[PDB]
Amino acid sequence: RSKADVERYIASVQGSTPSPRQKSMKGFYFAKLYMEAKEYDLAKKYICTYINVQERDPKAHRFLGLLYELEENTDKAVECYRRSVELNPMQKDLVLKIAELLCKNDVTDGRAKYWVERAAKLFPGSPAVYKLKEQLLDCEGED
């Protein structure tokens, strides 16, 4: 998909539902289409327009988190995923994902233990969680 293909769709929306709120309400479609076109900054811009008018949509926060995760912007990805899982706690997978991102970025992140413990509760016996706990144990001080 080209930038031009997405622009043609945005123009169609402008011609038929031109109100700023109707445009914002299409911003998740615009963002996904720009993600198809590998236009990551534009995808972030448009998903933000949508979050402005549909603030409680967990899917939009998760999509923005994925954009930040692709960029390796840990703090922003974790913030988005945290908001998504607050809005829709059925996404237990995001609890493990946050733990994993924090550990990958800086396992001396105090935040890692909190999320590893949350993940351990949701995924009892998980080797993915045990690997993170081993990493935390390896960087613990001694008495």
mmCIF file of C-alpha atoms in Angstrom:
data_model
loop_
_atom_site.group_PDB
_atom_site.id
_atom_site.type_symbol
_atom_site.label_atom_id
_atom_site.label_comp_id
_atom_site.label_asym_id
_atom_site.label_seq_id
_atom_site.Cartn_x
_atom_site.Cartn_y
_atom_site.Cartn_z
ATOM 1 C CA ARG A 1 0.000 0.000 0.000
ATOM 2 C CA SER A 2 1.321 3.464 -0.925
ATOM 3 C CA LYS A 3 1.003 6.732 0.957
ATOM 4 C CA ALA A 4 -1.144 7.825 -2.016
ATOM 5 C CA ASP A 5 -3.628 4.944 -1.585
ATOM 6 C CA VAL A 6 -4.158 5.955 2.042
ATOM 7 C CA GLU A 7 -4.509 9.633 1.110
ATOM 8 C CA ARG A 8 -7.185 8.745 -1.435
ATOM 9 C CA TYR A 9 -9.198 7.045 1.313
ATOM 10 C CA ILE A 10 -8.756 9.993 3.686
ATOM 11 C CA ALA A 11 -10.048 12.232 0.862
ATOM 12 C CA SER A 12 -13.100 10.004 0.379
ATOM 13 C CA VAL A 13 -13.891 10.335 4.068
ATOM 14 C CA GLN A 14 -13.480 14.154 3.869
ATOM 15 C CA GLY A 15 -15.985 14.325 1.006
ATOM 16 C CA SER A 16 -18.687 12.224 2.668
ATOM 17 C CA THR A 17 -18.338 12.674 6.434
ATOM 18 C CA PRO A 18 -16.428 15.971 6.710
ATOM 19 C CA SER A 19 -16.988 16.837 10.356
ATOM 20 C CA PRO A 20 -13.840 16.851 12.497
ATOM 21 C CA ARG A 21 -15.432 14.237 14.800
ATOM 22 C CA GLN A 22 -16.317 11.924 11.907
ATOM 23 C CA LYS A 23 -12.748 12.254 10.611
ATOM 24 C CA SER A 24 -11.316 11.444 14.053
ATOM 25 C CA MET A 25 -13.645 8.456 14.328
ATOM 26 C CA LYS A 26 -11.989 7.041 11.152
ATOM 27 C CA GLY A 27 -8.517 7.491 12.572
ATOM 28 C CA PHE A 28 -8.025 3.829 13.564
ATOM 29 C CA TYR A 29 -8.747 2.771 9.966
ATOM 30 C CA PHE A 30 -6.339 5.458 8.724
ATOM 31 C CA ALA A 31 -3.683 4.256 11.187
ATOM 32 C CA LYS A 32 -4.017 0.597 10.189
ATOM 33 C CA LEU A 33 -3.775 1.511 6.506
ATOM 34 C CA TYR A 34 -0.702 3.564 7.148
ATOM 35 C CA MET A 35 0.742 0.595 9.104
ATOM 36 C CA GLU A 36 0.108 -1.503 5.933
ATOM 37 C CA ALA A 37 2.030 1.146 3.942
ATOM 38 C CA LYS A 38 4.886 1.043 6.547
ATOM 39 C CA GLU A 39 4.228 4.684 7.317
ATOM 40 C CA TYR A 40 4.789 4.361 11.098
ATOM 41 C CA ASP A 41 4.814 8.044 12.023
ATOM 42 C CA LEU A 42 1.583 8.699 10.139
ATOM 43 C CA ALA A 43 0.042 5.613 11.806
ATOM 44 C CA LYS A 44 0.951 7.110 15.228
ATOM 45 C CA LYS A 45 -0.565 10.510 14.230
ATOM 46 C CA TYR A 46 -3.827 9.053 13.103
ATOM 47 C CA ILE A 47 -4.278 6.585 15.977
ATOM 48 C CA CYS A 48 -3.803 9.552 18.291
ATOM 49 C CA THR A 49 -6.674 11.375 16.604
ATOM 50 C CA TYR A 50 -8.837 8.384 17.272
ATOM 51 C CA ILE A 51 -7.792 7.947 20.900
ATOM 52 C CA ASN A 52 -8.781 11.636 21.388
ATOM 53 C CA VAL A 53 -12.423 10.805 20.566
ATOM 54 C CA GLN A 54 -12.529 7.140 21.730
ATOM 55 C CA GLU A 55 -10.302 7.351 24.740
ATOM 56 C CA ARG A 56 -11.425 4.138 26.273
ATOM 57 C CA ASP A 57 -10.810 1.886 23.209
ATOM 58 C CA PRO A 58 -8.220 -0.655 24.434
ATOM 59 C CA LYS A 59 -7.422 -1.746 20.901
ATOM 60 C CA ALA A 60 -6.265 1.712 19.944
ATOM 61 C CA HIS A 61 -3.944 1.942 22.959
ATOM 62 C CA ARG A 62 -2.560 -1.513 22.127
ATOM 63 C CA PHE A 63 -1.993 -0.513 18.511
ATOM 64 C CA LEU A 64 -0.138 2.637 19.555
ATOM 65 C CA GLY A 65 1.862 0.475 21.993
ATOM 66 C CA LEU A 66 2.804 -1.845 19.180
ATOM 67 C CA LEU A 67 4.016 1.183 17.127
ATOM 68 C CA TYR A 68 6.199 2.182 20.080
ATOM 69 C CA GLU A 69 7.358 -1.393 20.653
ATOM 70 C CA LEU A 70 8.454 -1.619 16.993
ATOM 71 C CA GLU A 71 10.488 1.566 17.606
ATOM 72 C CA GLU A 72 11.964 0.039 20.774
ATOM 73 C CA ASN A 73 10.586 2.928 22.812
ATOM 74 C CA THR A 74 10.085 0.932 25.960
ATOM 75 C CA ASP A 75 8.600 3.576 28.208
ATOM 76 C CA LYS A 76 5.990 4.618 25.664
ATOM 77 C CA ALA A 77 5.139 1.038 24.719
ATOM 78 C CA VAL A 78 4.681 0.087 28.369
ATOM 79 C CA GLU A 79 2.530 3.089 29.004
ATOM 80 C CA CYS A 80 0.223 2.227 26.085
ATOM 81 C CA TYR A 81 0.030 -1.443 26.983
ATOM 82 C CA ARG A 82 -0.624 -0.596 30.628
ATOM 83 C CA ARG A 83 -3.549 1.600 29.610
ATOM 84 C CA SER A 84 -4.859 -1.099 27.246
ATOM 85 C CA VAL A 85 -4.781 -3.831 29.850
ATOM 86 C CA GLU A 86 -6.464 -1.449 32.410
ATOM 87 C CA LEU A 87 -9.280 -0.856 29.944
ATOM 88 C CA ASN A 88 -9.582 -4.533 28.985
ATOM 89 C CA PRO A 89 -8.014 -6.877 31.554
ATOM 90 C CA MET A 90 -8.804 -9.952 29.469
ATOM 91 C CA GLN A 91 -5.536 -9.134 27.694
ATOM 92 C CA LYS A 92 -3.435 -11.197 30.068
ATOM 93 C CA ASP A 93 -0.880 -11.522 27.308
ATOM 94 C CA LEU A 94 -0.018 -7.830 27.662
ATOM 95 C CA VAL A 95 1.018 -8.372 31.297
ATOM 96 C CA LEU A 96 3.690 -10.828 30.107
ATOM 97 C CA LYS A 97 4.599 -8.505 27.221
ATOM 98 C CA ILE A 98 5.209 -5.551 29.569
ATOM 99 C CA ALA A 99 7.379 -7.737 31.821
ATOM 100 C CA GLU A 100 9.359 -8.908 28.796
ATOM 101 C CA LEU A 101 9.887 -5.402 27.418
ATOM 102 C CA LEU A 102 11.052 -4.047 30.741
ATOM 103 C CA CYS A 103 13.526 -6.894 31.243
ATOM 104 C CA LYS A 104 14.889 -6.604 27.712
ATOM 105 C CA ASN A 105 15.399 -2.831 28.049
ATOM 106 C CA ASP A 106 17.003 -2.728 31.500
ATOM 107 C CA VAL A 107 16.491 -5.607 33.924
ATOM 108 C CA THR A 108 17.603 -3.296 36.747
ATOM 109 C CA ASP A 109 14.343 -1.474 35.975
ATOM 110 C CA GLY A 110 12.574 -1.594 39.330
ATOM 111 C CA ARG A 111 9.396 -1.974 37.337
ATOM 112 C CA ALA A 112 10.385 -5.350 35.980
ATOM 113 C CA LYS A 113 9.828 -7.279 39.246
ATOM 114 C CA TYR A 114 6.322 -5.885 39.687
ATOM 115 C CA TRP A 115 5.323 -7.006 36.195
ATOM 116 C CA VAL A 116 7.121 -10.342 36.393
ATOM 117 C CA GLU A 117 5.178 -11.069 39.564
ATOM 118 C CA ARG A 118 1.900 -10.038 37.925
ATOM 119 C CA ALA A 119 2.713 -12.279 34.948
ATOM 120 C CA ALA A 120 3.672 -15.202 37.186
ATOM 121 C CA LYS A 121 0.200 -15.073 38.736
ATOM 122 C CA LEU A 122 -1.606 -15.077 35.353
ATOM 123 C CA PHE A 123 0.643 -17.749 33.799
ATOM 124 C CA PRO A 124 1.489 -20.261 36.528
ATOM 125 C CA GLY A 125 4.375 -22.479 35.568
ATOM 126 C CA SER A 126 5.279 -20.440 32.493
ATOM 127 C CA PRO A 127 8.869 -20.870 31.283
ATOM 128 C CA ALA A 128 8.671 -17.372 29.732
ATOM 129 C CA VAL A 129 8.075 -15.964 33.187
ATOM 130 C CA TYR A 130 10.710 -18.166 34.861
ATOM 131 C CA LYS A 131 13.340 -16.865 32.397
ATOM 132 C CA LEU A 132 12.560 -13.293 33.446
ATOM 133 C CA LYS A 133 12.763 -14.225 37.111
ATOM 134 C CA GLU A 134 16.160 -15.856 36.531
ATOM 135 C CA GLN A 135 17.328 -12.594 34.925
ATOM 136 C CA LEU A 136 16.122 -10.597 37.939
ATOM 137 C CA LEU A 137 17.792 -13.011 40.354
ATOM 138 C CA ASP A 138 21.065 -12.725 38.453
ATOM 139 C CA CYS A 139 21.202 -8.934 38.900
ATOM 140 C CA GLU A 140 20.087 -8.807 42.527
ATOM 141 C CA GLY A 141 22.655 -7.499 44.972
ATOM 142 C CA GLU A 142 23.888 -9.607 47.875
ATOM 143 C CA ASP A 143 23.538 -8.853 51.542
#
